[PDB]
C-alpha cells in the first residue's frame, strides 16, 4: 500500500480509501453492469506499488493500517502489539499473512505453532490425498489418488479461498479425541474408528495407468497386441 | 497427518462400541496421543480443534488466518455459549465398561489429511527370488521382489 | 464428491438431507446453523458432515459423457 502525507487528516494515511474498496467489491460482485475496477486500476492510480528487496531497503512499512497509521485499557488475551512509536511510514503491508507460500497458507493459525512444525506441514501437504483436478476421469496419469468424500476444513484460512482449497480439498474433518485410550496410539500412532472407516472415512480411489507400445525394430522384427496361445508362444 | 506436522500411522482400529463416547453419544473418528502435543508445542492443533468445534456447532466456518485478532478466549466464550465446556474438554465414558473416564478428554473435529504412505504399497518380504545378472545377489526394489 | 450417505462417526443418515439443505440455504435465506438445526442435525458430527461437504459431482457432470447412448 501507498502511504501519503494526507494533510487533510493531519497525519499520514493510506491512499486507498473506502471508495476504492467499494469499487473493488462492486467489480468482484458484478463478475459473479458498472465500470470495471481491477488490480491494474489500483496500480495506475498510485494506490499500490511494486517493491522488491532493493527498494525495501529504503522504505518504512507498517504492519496494519488501523494500528500503525493513526496517532496513539487493553485485552489481556490478545498478543502484544508494538506501535513502533514512529510515524514516518511510506508503505503499509497489504496483509501480513501474504508472506506465506501456497502450502503454508493451508495451516490454520501458523503463528501459534513452532516453526519447524509449520515447515513439516508445508512439506506434508504435497503428500495429502484428495481431488487434484476435476478431469481425473479423462486423464491417464501414472498414479492418481482421489478421496471419496473430500471436505473443506472447518478451520479455514482467508488465503486458501484464493488457492481454491474450499473447492478441491485434501482431507476430512475428523472428530478427534486427544486421549491415552488403550496404549495403541502411543507416540505418533492413532486409533481410528473402524465403524467410521466402514462408512467411508478417508476411503479413497487409486488409479494406476499402464502404457504399452508395439514397435518395429526393422522389417519383420515387430510385435503385435494379441492374446497368446500356449501352442505357439 | 493433521495440518500441523502431526503425522503418524494408524495403530489399531476399534469399532464404535469400544471407543469412548460423550454424553451425546458422539464417538471420535480418531484418537491421538497427548504426548504429541507438549514436545512439539503444537498449540494451533488445539486451537484449530476448538475453532472447528465452534464452527460445527454454529454453522459458520472458522477464520483461522494467522495474524488476525482472534483469541482463544473468544472461542472459549463462543463454545460456552453453545452449552459445552469452554476449553473443549468433554466428559467421556469408557467404551468397554461404560464407566466415566476419570479425566475429561479434549474433544472436537480436526481437519486430517490422508497421506500416500499406505502400508500395502510398502510391505515387502522375500524368502528367495530372482538374482542380479552380474553379482548374483538379490535384486533391488519391492516391485521386483527384491532383497 | 457427492454427499455421504451416513455420518462418519454416529451413522445418522445424512445423504437424504443435502438437497433440502440447499433449499434451506439458497431461497429461504437462512444461515447455515439454522439450516442444520432445521434438518435435526443436533450433534456436531452430522453438522460437519453436511456443512463441510463439497459437491464435486456438478463439476464432474459438466464434462461430456464418454459413452453417450
Amino acid at each position: 500500500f501507498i502511504v501519503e502525507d494526507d494533510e487533510s487528516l493531519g497525519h499520514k494515511e493510506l491512499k486507498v480509501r473506502k471508495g476504492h474498496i467499494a469499487k473493488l467489491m462492486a467489480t468482484e460482485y458484478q463478475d459473479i453492469d458498472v465500470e470495471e475496477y481491477t488490480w491494474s486500476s489500483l496500480l495506475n492510480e498510485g494506490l499500490v506499488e511494486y517493491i522488491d528487496a532493493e527498494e525495501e531497503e529504503s522504505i518504512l512499512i507498517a504492519m496494519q493500517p488501523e494500528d500503525l497509521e493513526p496517532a496513539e485499557d487493553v485485552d489481556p488475551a490478545k498478543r502484544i502489539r508494538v506501535s513502533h512509536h514512529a510515524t514516518t511510514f511510506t508503505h503499509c503491508e497489504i496483509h501480513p499473512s501474504m508472506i506465506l507460500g501456497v502450502a503454508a497458507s493451508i495451516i490454520p493459525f501458523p503463528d501459534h505453532n513452532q516453526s519447524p512444525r509449520n515447515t513439516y506441514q508445508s512439506a506434508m501437504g504435497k503428500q495429502a490425498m484428495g481431488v487434484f483436478l476435476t478431469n481425473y476421469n479423462v486423464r491417464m496419469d501414472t498414479m492418481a489418488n482421489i478421496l471419496y468424500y473430500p471436505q473443506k476444513p472447518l478451520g479455514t484460512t482467508r488465503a486458501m479461498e484464493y488457492l481454491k482449497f474450499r473447492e478441491l480439498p485434501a482431507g476430512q474433518n475428523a472428530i478427534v479425541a486427544i486421549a491415552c485410550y488403550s496404549g495403541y496410539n502411543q507416540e505418533d500412532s492413532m486409533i481410528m474408528n473402524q465403524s467410521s472407516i466402514d462408512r467411508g472415512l478417508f476411503r479413497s480411489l487409486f488409479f494406476r495407468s499402464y502404457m504399452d507400445q508395439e514397435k518395429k525394430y526393422g522389417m519383420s522384427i515387430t510385435e503385435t497386441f494379441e492374446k497368446p496361445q500356449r501352442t505357439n508362444t | 497427518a493433521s495440518r500441523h506436522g502431526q503425522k503418524g500411522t494408524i495403530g489399531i482400529t476399534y469399532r464404535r462400541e469400544d471407543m469412548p463416547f460423550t454424553a451425546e453419544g458422539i464417538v471420535p473418528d480418531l484418537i491421538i496421543n497427548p504426548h504429541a502435543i507438549p514436545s512439539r508445542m503444537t498449540v494451533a492443533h488445539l486451537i484449530e480443534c476448538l475453532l472447528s468445534k465452534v464452527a460445527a456447532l454454529s454453522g459458520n466456518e472458522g477464520d483461522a488466518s494467522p495474524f488476525t485478532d482472534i483469541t482463544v478466549e473468544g472461542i472459549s466464550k463462543l463454545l460456552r455459549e453453545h452449552g459445552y465446556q469452554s476449553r473443549g474438554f468433554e466428559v467421556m465414558y469408557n467404551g468397554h465398561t461404560g464407566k466415566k473416564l476419570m479425566a475429561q478428554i479434549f474433544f472436537g473435529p480436526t481437519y486430517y489429511q490422508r497421506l500416500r504412505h499406505m502400508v500395502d504399497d510398502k510391505i515387502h518380504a522375500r524368502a528367495r527370488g530372482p538374482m542380479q545378472v552380474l553379482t548374483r545377489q538379490p535384486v533391488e526394489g519391492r516391485s521386483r521382489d527384491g532383497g | 464428491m457427492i454427499v455421504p450417505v451416513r455420518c462418519f462417526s454416529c451413522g445418522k443418515v445424512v445423504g437424504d438431507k443435502w438437497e433440502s439443505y440447499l433449499n434451506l440455504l439458497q431461497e429461504d435465506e437462512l444461515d447455515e446453523g439454522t439450516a442444520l438445526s432445521r434438518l435435526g442435525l443436533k450433534r456436531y458430527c452430522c453438522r460437519r458432515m453436511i456443512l463441510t461437504h463439497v459437491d464435486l459431482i456438478e463439476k464432474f457432470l459438466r464434462y461430456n459423457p464418454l459413452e453417450k447412448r
Binding site: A26 | S58, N60, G62, T68, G74, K77 | -
Partner: peptide, 19 residues
C-alpha cells in the same frame, strides 16, 4: 472479541443491498 468466522455471503447480500 472479533467474530472468528469467514462469513462472506452475508456481506455479499449486504453489498447487494447497498447496490
Amino acid at each position: 472479541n472479533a467474530s472468528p468466522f469467514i462469513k462472506r455471503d452475508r456481506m455479499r447480500r449486504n453489498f447487494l443491498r447497498m447496490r
